[PDB]
Design an enzyme around this catalytic site. Sequence first.
Site, PDB file in Angstrom:
ATOM      1  N   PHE A  66      79.145 188.368 -12.721  1.00 48.85           N
ATOM      2  CA  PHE A  66      78.219 189.186 -11.948  1.00 48.85           C
ATOM      3  C   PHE A  66      76.893 188.457 -11.763  1.00 48.85           C
ATOM      4  CE2 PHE A  66      78.440 193.536 -10.392  1.00 48.85           C
ATOM      5  CZ  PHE A  66      77.142 193.772 -10.002  1.00 48.85           C
ATOM      6  N   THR A  88      80.455 182.803 -15.521  1.00 47.66           N
ATOM      7  CA  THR A  88      80.613 181.608 -16.338  1.00 47.66           C
ATOM      8  C   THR A  88      79.813 180.431 -15.794  1.00 47.66           C
ATOM      9  OG1 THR A  88      82.869 182.249 -17.002  1.00 47.66           O
ATOM     10  CG2 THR A  88      82.247 179.934 -17.262  1.00 47.66           C
ATOM     11  N   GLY A 116      85.658 180.429  -7.564  1.00 46.33           N
ATOM     12  CA  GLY A 116      85.495 179.229  -8.356  1.00 46.33           C
ATOM     13  C   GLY A 116      84.377 179.427  -9.368  1.00 46.33           C
ATOM     14  N   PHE A 117      83.724 178.326  -9.729  1.00 41.68           N
ATOM     15  CA  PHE A 117      82.632 178.394 -10.693  1.00 41.68           C
ATOM     16  C   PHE A 117      81.315 178.007 -10.037  1.00 41.68           C
ATOM     17  CE2 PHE A 117      84.409 178.813 -15.142  1.00 41.68           C
ATOM     18  CZ  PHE A 117      85.613 179.329 -14.715  1.00 41.68           C
ATOM     19  N   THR A 187      90.487 178.258 -10.732  1.00 42.17           N
ATOM     20  CA  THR A 187      90.179 176.866 -11.039  1.00 42.17           C
ATOM     21  C   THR A 187      91.479 176.147 -11.371  1.00 42.17           C
ATOM     22  OG1 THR A 187      88.181 177.766 -12.068  1.00 42.17           O
ATOM     23  CG2 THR A 187      88.542 175.387 -12.231  1.00 42.17           C
ATOM     24  N   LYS A 238      88.086 184.301 -23.814  1.00 43.51           N
ATOM     25  CA  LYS A 238      88.491 185.072 -22.645  1.00 43.51           C
ATOM     26  C   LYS A 238      89.925 184.704 -22.293  1.00 43.51           C
ATOM     27  CE  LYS A 238      87.040 187.833 -19.116  1.00 43.51           C
ATOM     28  NZ  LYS A 238      86.157 187.461 -17.973  1.00 43.51           N
ATOM     29  N   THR A 268      91.278 188.544 -14.775  1.00 43.80           N
ATOM     30  CA  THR A 268      91.937 188.866 -13.512  1.00 43.80           C
ATOM     31  C   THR A 268      93.345 188.269 -13.469  1.00 43.80           C
ATOM     32  OG1 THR A 268      91.149 186.922 -12.313  1.00 43.80           O
ATOM     33  CG2 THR A 268      89.678 188.822 -12.440  1.00 43.80           C
ATOM     34  N   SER A 286      90.731 191.992  -9.311  1.00 38.66           N
ATOM     35  CA  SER A 286      90.068 192.816 -10.307  1.00 38.66           C
ATOM     36  C   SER A 286      90.134 194.272  -9.866  1.00 38.66           C
ATOM     37  CB  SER A 286      88.608 192.386 -10.504  1.00 38.66           C
ATOM     38  OG  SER A 286      88.529 191.014 -10.844  1.00 38.66           O
ATOM     39  N   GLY A 287      89.806 195.168 -10.794  1.00 38.40           N
ATOM     40  CA  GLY A 287      89.665 196.568 -10.459  1.00 38.40           C
ATOM     41  C   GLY A 287      90.746 197.479 -10.999  1.00 38.40           C
ATOM     42  N   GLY A 316      89.499 197.061 -15.192  1.00 42.30           N
ATOM     43  CA  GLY A 316      89.873 198.339 -14.627  1.00 42.30           C
ATOM     44  C   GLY A 316      89.192 199.553 -15.213  1.00 42.30           C
TER      45      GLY A 316
HETATM   46  C1  LIG Z   1      83.727 187.989  -7.821  1.00 37.55           C
HETATM   47  C2  LIG Z   1      84.200 187.883  -9.241  1.00 37.55           C
HETATM   48  C3  LIG Z   1      83.717 186.847 -10.024  1.00 37.55           C
HETATM   49  C4  LIG Z   1      84.127 186.716 -11.342  1.00 37.55           C
HETATM   50  N1  LIG Z   1      83.641 185.675 -12.099  1.00 37.55           N
HETATM   51  C5  LIG Z   1      84.035 185.538 -13.410  1.00 37.55           C
HETATM   52  C6  LIG Z   1      83.538 184.494 -14.176  1.00 37.55           C
HETATM   53  O1  LIG Z   1      82.744 183.696 -13.681  1.00 37.55           O
HETATM   54  N2  LIG Z   1      83.939 184.354 -15.488  1.00 37.55           N
HETATM   55  C7  LIG Z   1      84.830 185.250 -16.036  1.00 37.55           C
HETATM   56  O2  LIG Z   1      85.183 185.121 -17.204  1.00 37.55           O
HETATM   57  N3  LIG Z   1      85.325 186.293 -15.279  1.00 37.55           N
HETATM   58  C8  LIG Z   1      84.930 186.440 -13.965  1.00 37.55           C
HETATM   59  N4  LIG Z   1      85.424 187.480 -13.204  1.00 37.55           N
HETATM   60  C9  LIG Z   1      86.392 188.447 -13.818  1.00 37.55           C
HETATM   61  C10 LIG Z   1      85.631 189.679 -14.291  1.00 37.55           C
HETATM   62  O3  LIG Z   1      84.635 189.280 -15.203  1.00 37.55           O
HETATM   63  C11 LIG Z   1      86.553 190.689 -14.966  1.00 37.55           C
HETATM   64  O4  LIG Z   1      87.244 190.053 -16.017  1.00 37.55           O
HETATM   65  C12 LIG Z   1      87.540 191.269 -13.961  1.00 37.55           C
HETATM   66  O5  LIG Z   1      86.889 191.445 -12.724  1.00 37.55           O
HETATM   67  C13 LIG Z   1      88.086 192.614 -14.413  1.00 37.55           C
HETATM   68  O6  LIG Z   1      87.034 193.548 -14.401  1.00 37.55           O
HETATM   69  P1  LIG Z   1      87.204 194.973 -13.669  1.00 37.55           P
HETATM   70  O7  LIG Z   1      88.659 195.368 -13.662  1.00 37.55           O
HETATM   71  O8  LIG Z   1      86.384 196.022 -14.380  1.00 37.55           O
HETATM   72  O9  LIG Z   1      86.715 194.829 -12.253  1.00 37.55           O
HETATM   73  C14 LIG Z   1      85.023 187.622 -11.891  1.00 37.55           C
HETATM   74  C15 LIG Z   1      85.509 188.662 -11.113  1.00 37.55           C
HETATM   75  C16 LIG Z   1      85.101 188.801  -9.789  1.00 37.55           C
HETATM   76  C17 LIG Z   1      85.655 189.940  -8.981  1.00 37.55           C
HETATM   77  C1  LIG Z   2      77.369 194.920  -6.899  1.00 30.17           C
HETATM   78  C2  LIG Z   2      78.421 194.535  -5.832  1.00 30.17           C
HETATM   79  C3  LIG Z   2      79.142 193.216  -5.979  1.00 30.17           C
HETATM   80  N1  LIG Z   2      80.133 192.815  -5.002  1.00 30.17           N
HETATM   81  C4  LIG Z   2      80.827 191.540  -5.174  1.00 30.17           C
HETATM   82  C5  LIG Z   2      81.034 190.523  -6.302  1.00 30.17           C
HETATM   83  C6  LIG Z   2      82.166 191.468  -5.913  1.00 30.17           C
HETATM   84  C7  LIG Z   2      80.440 193.698  -3.866  1.00 30.17           C
HETATM   85  O1  LIG Z   2      81.253 193.370  -3.069  1.00 30.17           O
HETATM   86  C8  LIG Z   2      79.694 195.068  -3.707  1.00 30.17           C
HETATM   87  N2  LIG Z   2      79.786 196.058  -2.763  1.00 30.17           N
HETATM   88  N3  LIG Z   2      78.888 197.058  -3.114  1.00 30.17           N
HETATM   89  C9  LIG Z   2      78.670 198.302  -2.366  1.00 30.17           C
HETATM   90  C10 LIG Z   2      78.242 196.720  -4.232  1.00 30.17           C
HETATM   91  C11 LIG Z   2      77.171 197.580  -4.954  1.00 30.17           C
HETATM   92  C12 LIG Z   2      75.886 197.785  -4.113  1.00 30.17           C
HETATM   93  C13 LIG Z   2      75.231 196.695  -3.539  1.00 30.17           C
HETATM   94  C14 LIG Z   2      74.070 196.959  -2.810  1.00 30.17           C
HETATM   95  C15 LIG Z   2      73.615 198.273  -2.689  1.00 30.17           C
HETATM   96  C16 LIG Z   2      72.340 198.574  -1.892  1.00 30.17           C
HETATM   97  F1  LIG Z   2      71.278 197.997  -2.531  1.00 30.17           F
HETATM   98  F2  LIG Z   2      72.453 198.067  -0.627  1.00 30.17           F
HETATM   99  F3  LIG Z   2      72.157 199.926  -1.833  1.00 30.17           F
HETATM  100  N4  LIG Z   2      74.269 199.274  -3.260  1.00 30.17           N
HETATM  101  C17 LIG Z   2      75.375 199.075  -3.961  1.00 30.17           C
HETATM  102  C18 LIG Z   2      78.736 195.463  -4.644  1.00 30.17           C
HETATM  103  O1  LIG Z   3      87.538 184.170 -14.671  1.00 25.30           O
HETATM  104  C1  LIG Z   3      87.478 184.271 -13.455  1.00 25.30           C
HETATM  105  C2  LIG Z   3      86.653 183.479 -12.575  1.00 25.30           C
HETATM  106  C3  LIG Z   3      86.689 183.699 -11.246  1.00 25.30           C
HETATM  107  C4  LIG Z   3      85.864 182.929 -10.210  1.00 25.30           C
HETATM  108  O2  LIG Z   3      86.531 182.379  -9.317  1.00 25.30           O
HETATM  109  O3  LIG Z   3      84.642 182.947 -10.378  1.00 25.30           O
HETATM  110  N1  LIG Z   3      87.492 184.658 -10.721  1.00 25.30           N
HETATM  111  C5  LIG Z   3      88.310 185.463 -11.454  1.00 25.30           C
HETATM  112  O4  LIG Z   3      89.021 186.317 -10.964  1.00 25.30           O
HETATM  113  N2  LIG Z   3      88.254 185.218 -12.802  1.00 25.30           N
END
Ligand SMILES: Cc1cc2nc3c(=O)[nH]c(=O)nc-3n(C[C@H](O)[C@H](O)[C@H](O)COP(=O)(O)O)c2cc1C
Ligand SMILES: Cc1cn(C2CC2)c(=O)c2nn(C)c(Cc3ccc(C(F)(F)F)nc3)c12
Ligand SMILES: O=c1cc(C(O)O)[nH]c(=O)[nH]1
Length: 374
Positions: A66, A88, A116-117, A187, A238, A268, A286-287, A316
């Site tokens: 995040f 990461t 990616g990273f 990766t 992890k 994921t 994810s999710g 999730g």
């Molecule tokens: C856009 C994105 C970037 C992520 N980057 C990383 C990461 O850099 N390192 C890591 O360990 N997991 C990363 N994850 C995996 C999440 O940390 C988490 O393990 C996964 O999304 C499951 O969470 P959730 O089911 O609550 O969404 C990433 C996931 C998403 C969607």
């Molecule tokens: C936090 C977030 C992350 N990511 C990607 C890495 C997966 C999304 O795709 C997202 N989509 N939404 C709607 C959000 C939450 C969000 C963003 C901005 C605003 C406001 F400020 F405009 F109001 N409100 C809510 C997301």
């Molecule tokens: O651990 C990880 C890292 C990433 C990423 O591409 O940043 N994506 C994932 O779904 N899991």
Amino acid sequence: NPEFFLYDIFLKFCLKYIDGEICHDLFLLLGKYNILPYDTSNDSIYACTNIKHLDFINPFGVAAGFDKNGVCIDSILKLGFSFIEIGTITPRGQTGNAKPRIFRDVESRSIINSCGFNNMGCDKVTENLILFRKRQEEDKLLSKHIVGVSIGKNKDTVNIVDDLKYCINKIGRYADYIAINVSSPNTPGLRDNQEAGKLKNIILSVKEEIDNLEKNNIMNDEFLWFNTTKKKPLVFVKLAPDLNQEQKKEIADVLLETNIDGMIISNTTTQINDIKSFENKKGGVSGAKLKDISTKFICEMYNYTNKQIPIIASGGIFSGLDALEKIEAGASVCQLYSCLVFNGMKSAVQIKRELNHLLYQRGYYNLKEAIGRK
Ligand SMILES: Cc1cc2nc3c(=O)[nH]c(=O)nc-3n(C[C@H](O)[C@H](O)[C@H](O)COP(=O)(O)O)c2cc1C
Ligand SMILES: Cc1cn(C2CC2)c(=O)c2nn(C)c(Cc3ccc(C(F)(F)F)nc3)c12
Ligand SMILES: O=c1cc(C(O)O)[nH]c(=O)[nH]1
């Protein structure tokens, strides 16, 4: 808080019309300038949880990926989370794979990412964390909050251990715990590092590198660790869900013998094929579609480790029961990601309310009593 709900108004607009990463970058921008809501309420002392000497005021933090660069720590933690896992990170900065690389499916509450990273690099991210720790010592809303760092390797890194050294030796003294990312599906060949032999070597080296920072200092431990605990950062691993059990039991046998401090379960997956909108799109998902899968992985590893290694739930989690299911499976703490994506600012206040009510109804004195009750 009245201002939690304003961002829920904009949220639907964002989900329906705006690119995910653009929303993500926007999110980070608001936090950079401290324009997010706050949750200054005292947390339920019945939900305060711990991982060894790491004491979490509540069992909910924000998952890695995040705030991959610690440019948004203060605001996110102030939303109501007890901790955050940044990264990461890799030694040098990367731009990651080509955009667009993040795609939401609102209907199934699912995400797919091929990021990616991408990160600003270990050095610059370390400065961002120094800035934070200096603000933490001056802000009471942050005095008890914890910050862990997820660490990994650059795509072109030859030996993963070399990258683990540089980051640990650069940022270890400012981190409360290290998360070993050997599980990212985006990766190439990164998930081949979970083979027992090298993961063993990986864990031992991480523990060793962290252990080596304490020796050569003139200052006492108090001024060595400019973190929350004033203590050596714990080491978590992890794990990816796309493994067979033979690989899992090998890992379990290893992390018990090498004395890992914890294990983040899980990550994921690439094996989900029941999402029509993500067809022909690369990356890990994810999710919600990962909720059930992950919880079972926790049970497996929680059993494969004979309950001797603490767990950090991740995958999730949307509702208080979703978290309890993973708590009762063996998890001590939970991380959220997609929840923030689809629920917004009320994520923490919602899942903390929900969990407290359920603990009260199920007849539990505190959260620890629920660990592994299943
Ligand atoms: C856009 C994105 C970037 C992520 N980057 C990383 C990461 O850099 N390192 C890591 O360990 N997991 C990363 N994850 C995996 C999440 O940390 C988490 O393990 C996964 O999304 C499951 O969470 P959730 O089911 O609550 O969404 C990433 C996931 C998403 C969607
Ligand atoms: C936090 C977030 C992350 N990511 C990607 C890495 C997966 C999304 O795709 C997202 N989509 N939404 C709607 C959000 C939450 C969000 C963003 C901005 C605003 C406001 F400020 F405009 F109001 N409100 C809510 C997301
Ligand atoms: O651990 C990880 C890292 C990433 C990423 O591409 O940043 N994506 C994932 O779904 N899991």
